[PDB]
Amino acid sequence: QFTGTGTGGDVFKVDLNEQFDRADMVWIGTASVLVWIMIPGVGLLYSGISRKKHALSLMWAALMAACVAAFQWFWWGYSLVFAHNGSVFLGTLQNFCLKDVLGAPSIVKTVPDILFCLYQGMFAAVTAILMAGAGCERARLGPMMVFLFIWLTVVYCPIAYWTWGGNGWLVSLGALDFAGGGPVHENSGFAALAYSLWLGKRHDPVAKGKVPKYKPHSVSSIVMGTIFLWFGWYGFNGGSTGNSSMRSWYACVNTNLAAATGGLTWMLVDWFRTGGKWSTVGLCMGAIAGLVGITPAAGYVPVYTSVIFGIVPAIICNFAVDLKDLLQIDDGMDVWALHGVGGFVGNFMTGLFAADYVAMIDGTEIDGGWMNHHWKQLGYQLAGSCAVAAWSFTVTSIILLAMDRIPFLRIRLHEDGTDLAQIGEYAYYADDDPETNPYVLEPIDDT
Amino acid sequence: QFTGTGTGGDVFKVDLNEQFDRADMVWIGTASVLVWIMIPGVGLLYSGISRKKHALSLMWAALMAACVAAFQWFWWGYSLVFAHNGSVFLGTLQNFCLKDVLGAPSIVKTVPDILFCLYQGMFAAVTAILMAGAGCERARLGPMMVFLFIWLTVVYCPIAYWTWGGNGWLVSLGALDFAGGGPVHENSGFAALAYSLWLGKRHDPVAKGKVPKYKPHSVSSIVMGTIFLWFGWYGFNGGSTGNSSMRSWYACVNTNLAAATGGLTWMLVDWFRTGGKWSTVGLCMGAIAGLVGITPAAGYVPVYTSVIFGIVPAIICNFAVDLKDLLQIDDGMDVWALHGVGGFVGNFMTGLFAADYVAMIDGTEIDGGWMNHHWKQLGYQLAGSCAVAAWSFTVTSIILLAMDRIPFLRIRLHEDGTDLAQIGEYAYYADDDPETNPYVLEPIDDT
Amino acid sequence: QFTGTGTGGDVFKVDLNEQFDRADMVWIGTASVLVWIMIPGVGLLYSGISRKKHALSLMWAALMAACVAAFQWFWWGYSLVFAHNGSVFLGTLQNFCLKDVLGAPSIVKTVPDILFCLYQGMFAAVTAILMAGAGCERARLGPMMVFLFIWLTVVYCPIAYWTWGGNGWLVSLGALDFAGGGPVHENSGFAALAYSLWLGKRHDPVAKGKVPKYKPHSVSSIVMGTIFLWFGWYGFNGGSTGNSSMRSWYACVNTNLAAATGGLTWMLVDWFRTGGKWSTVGLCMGAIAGLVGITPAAGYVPVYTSVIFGIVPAIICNFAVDLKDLLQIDDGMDVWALHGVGGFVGNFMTGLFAADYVAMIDGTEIDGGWMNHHWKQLGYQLAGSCAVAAWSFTVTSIILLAMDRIPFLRIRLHEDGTDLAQIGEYAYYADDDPETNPYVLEPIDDT
Ligand SMILES: CCCCCCCCCCO[C@@H]1O[C@@H](CO)[C@H](O[C@H]2O[C@@H](CO)[C@H](O)[C@H](O)[C@H]2O)[C@@H](O)[C@H]1O
Ligand SMILES: CCCCCCCCCCO[C@@H]1O[C@@H](CO)[C@H](O[C@H]2O[C@@H](CO)[C@H](O)[C@H](O)[C@H]2O)[C@@H](O)[C@H]1O
Ligand SMILES: CCCCCCCCCCO[C@@H]1O[C@@H](CO)[C@H](O[C@H]2O[C@@H](CO)[C@H](O)[C@H](O)[C@H]2O)[C@@H](O)[C@H]1O
């Protein structure tokens, strides 16, 4: 009388709630709310850090992303990731417009479909504002919204299915990704690098010669963003057990400690490299690097190793940021360095420190990693993170370039010398007051 | 040995907690905390949107409202709405100063009195800062606080009882109001219109001729407010089941989707009406309109209809805002257009799309609306929303006018030409710095 | 097969989760997240209130404190407070680096070790940013971080053990401290007074003669801080039951009401003392005073007495702030007046109003206070708050002075007249822009 398909049964004849522990559902409902406030967190963070005045306010853009992503998820995003009749590479349109999404056990069986929909939808939205922030410089809004809908559909949704889906080939292969380091962070990072390399401003003056590595538009914005992100990450990582067990709280302790050691580590590196300065921007980026690092690992690794997930990503991401000098590109490179590089490092290290007895805390069964002499685990992590990077860079490139050849879908004006025109363009962007301007400052052309 | 009255029994002889599912209580406790942060959310929103410099900071005023409303609720607000011995129009003073408020099942039987008190108290506080924001222009603080205490007592509390109370006549009549669209939004909106029409500044220059429809004091404030409100609304709507079932999470999905489609819809309307501009203020107002729209409906309607609750309120509220031109009044009209008009539209539409099988998800029994060929439901919604609008406008008018004839209770100086006096009044309000001024800039008169 | 020691048992043979109610764990997990956002709350509050421009941004410093405190807690802070093999004055290094912290019932038996670790760790972090804010004026960052690690280890951890530990002598003596008014507020306040008296700037011009009592750096910052603190305090106080019972929600109602009456009370006192001005800073400080006041009491006293916990601390703390005039010291005195004095008053009053039938709501057994003719309870409170004040002032003094005699550990330059040097020092601090400066403005000396 509980069917385990469609709606899960007839509400007029059964209590669909009897299939689930109530406390499990409450923790996952709460966690969903927490992940949501991470979305403006991303916006405040990349708005503040910018070494350039972005015409588009990313704090505002975070609300736009929340709107676009929620409609995409409802329309067919959810179905494409978490339908029960999927192949090994993709879901279906079976839950188009959330049809029959109710009380059947979700692919995470301790919660029903409708709760898993709510939870996982927040993950797609966080990824959308990361993507929007990566390609925001001189972006046209219309094209940006279209781009996000397309990118969530053909880049986020396939990768998410491989990672989390019923018959996802990475699931079947035995690759570990606790809280979606692959679909969210690694994914958005390498999509950001496609933006940088194809549409980013080349020979950029903020990224060339002896200019300061850190030159923030707004420190108070960076801090507010980091606050929202660290606060929300308890639901992001802690809710990825799908339950109310103590593995949830174990994963929260790991999240806190990786952030803390990441923050301190990056600020220490900067101290050595500057000859004794204390970096305010760097402490914040280090916390984000630890959070990203521990994401694929938080419910799999022992508590004292969570420190390594703060330390090692902070060091490597800190140096990765220097590649902006080498390439002389600024646009999009911060998101690649933190989420792309940090996601890769964290996914790799999970292969080293995953432990079957950490997973077993709530009955979850894994072979483990190098901790349990499971050497081959490292190979499973690499196949995951290489597949994710390859698909993300390639398909994001194809979308950017294809939209670039269509005049009314082009995301960024090509900027391909009238004295009067240059004076006007400068003043157009310089005089704008985002605080009081009721309208988006749309990129301006020769007409 | 569980009495079901007063305190519910003797703590020294029974565990009063045995009467309730623990997960139910945890979700409602959590939801209470969430609703609380909506209070500064309202303050930041209406502070930012203002086309005029308000002498009173509404962000600060939100904390004042939290103080006044919590004391009023404790004193007799709770008793007047949720006492167990009420008539059909009002409660009693039986729980004066929260006497014997403990472990008896509340009128929402899945939680005890003391938890329902906490939860529903947040609803009264949200309504108080909406009211304070509606009548803040040139308000005197002393009179404003008194006004709020009186207005919560004789306007909020009767309407809330009709909607939610043990023998409330709207409850008995079969009108649907899931999360209090009536007591909170519709109520505060039509009380706002009474302020506009009786005390609002007439022939206002920001609302007359060809002046810009949107001219915000602070965009970053609007965005921060919208963030807090959308975040908190998960508890506002999701906790209105009184339990931990999947109807709670179903209602959260509806809340997210209505906000998203409301945001996109209002920004699209503005795009047509401006000939291609992207409205930053409008995206935010559209999200608020959807949230308001879905409030009476969130746990009653099917997921794909939640889109309509974003779209239709966004369009109608957008045009309602133009009535400010027609009347040449600005003061108080934003709250009427969003909460008054949006609450009305959402209450009406609930009569159309309510479905007994959506309610049945957690065992709740309703005849449903037009979805279940229950045509008469639309008539029940209209009687609710007309009663609410009539009582709110009339009794708020009477309070405003009565306080206006008492010199030391008058809320706003009548402003009924010395050259020197006008220069001084202008400079008084212009020179004030809210960031650093330790005191409220009290309205200034000829002495 | 549940051992009740070390890890609590073998995860491969038992479900350690069977020992606990799931709803209990979910509420305490949620509460932990809430307490965390109180940390930037403290930072925003004391940044905004300052009558001086602090070279160190306290909003930023709150994230630093979160990093340092999380690492200290992991390293040995947790072990020193909540190890199961402690003496009567201190814990052990048994859980060094969180070794074997998992599934054994914690000293609060309704939650496991790993969840109690997470929860109580937030309390240590809140105390760390209070301490950092108290001694931030002209602080050198390196020394400040070292200082925090040392102070949490030898001041916070002993006092916390006495209050909360397995064999803590204050626990055994029967002193009541519901949510840690002793370890957090009283403690940090009297440590702040040691800073003021030993390192604070003497004959300070902002604290001398006829200068304004309130002269805030940023009102919007005070308000944002108060918002985060009041929001988080629901977890701070509500989670101190260790469970999901209605005593948790009872304690939340008490928290809300004490804040509200504290806010209104302080603003009323200021109104009398200024001859009719409305104090924006004072409403906020009054809310904080009530929150502090009700902290040792929230789950022990009857609801209508929670009003007294707002009123009496607001009055006394308001006058305590005047002692800054008497001493002509500003540095560190705000934290003493609010948390030191307010913690003392609230601890004292708990001895008066504690009621065994309030505790009994969830089965907790106490003799009660003067409500249950238990006169001796007042003596137990005094011994607690005198021990806490004595240990905090003395050992903080010794740490400050000892670091002051070591050139590279000195927290504040001694400031012990070149015309050119004075012009330069003035311009150094005046010209700094915290919004855009990528580095901490380190105190500057003659080289
Ligand atoms: C499910 C989510 C989907 C939401 C809706 C998506 C709609 C997007 C389609 C593109 O729309 C165009 O985008 C603007 C570019 O941003 C256009 O140009 C506007 O902006 C300038 C571009 O900078 C132009 O030069 C024009 O002056 C001005 O009309 C604007 O007219 C509009 O036609
Ligand atoms: C349970 C919640 C209730 C909380 C307490 C409510 C108390 C309110 C009563 C009214 O109080 C008056 O309000 C001020 C007006 O705002 C008065 O004028 C003050 O403000 C100016 C008005 O603009 C005046 O001209 C005077 O100079 C100045 O004394 C002030 O003196 C005070 O008498
Ligand atoms: C577990 C948490 C622990 C985290 C790490 C703690 C490390 C703290 C040790 C002290 O470090 C010193 O602190 C700076 C003082 O703040 C020093 O001077 C720096 O700052 C100026 C002091 O104002 C000096 O004059 C110098 O120019 C400049 O090098 C800096 O070099 C560094 O040696």
Residue numbers in the entry:
A (entry chain A), B (entry chain A), C (entry chain A): 4 to 419, 424 to 454
Publication excerpt:
structures of the Mep2 transceptors from S. cerevisiae and C. albicans. function as ammonium receptors/sensors in fungal development. a central channel for the transport of ammonium. non-phosphorylated, with channels that are closed on the cytoplasmic side.
The channels of phosphorylation-mimicking mutants of C. well-defined electronegative pocket that is solvent accessible. in turn might cause substantial conformational changes within the CTR. residues has only undergone a slight shift compared with the WT protein. WT CaMep2, the DD mutant and phosphorylated protein (S453J). from Asp452 and Asp453, presumably to avoid electrostatic repulsion. generates conformational changes in the conserved part of the CTR. Leu427 to Asp438 unravels during the simulations to a disordered state. remainder of the protein is not affected.
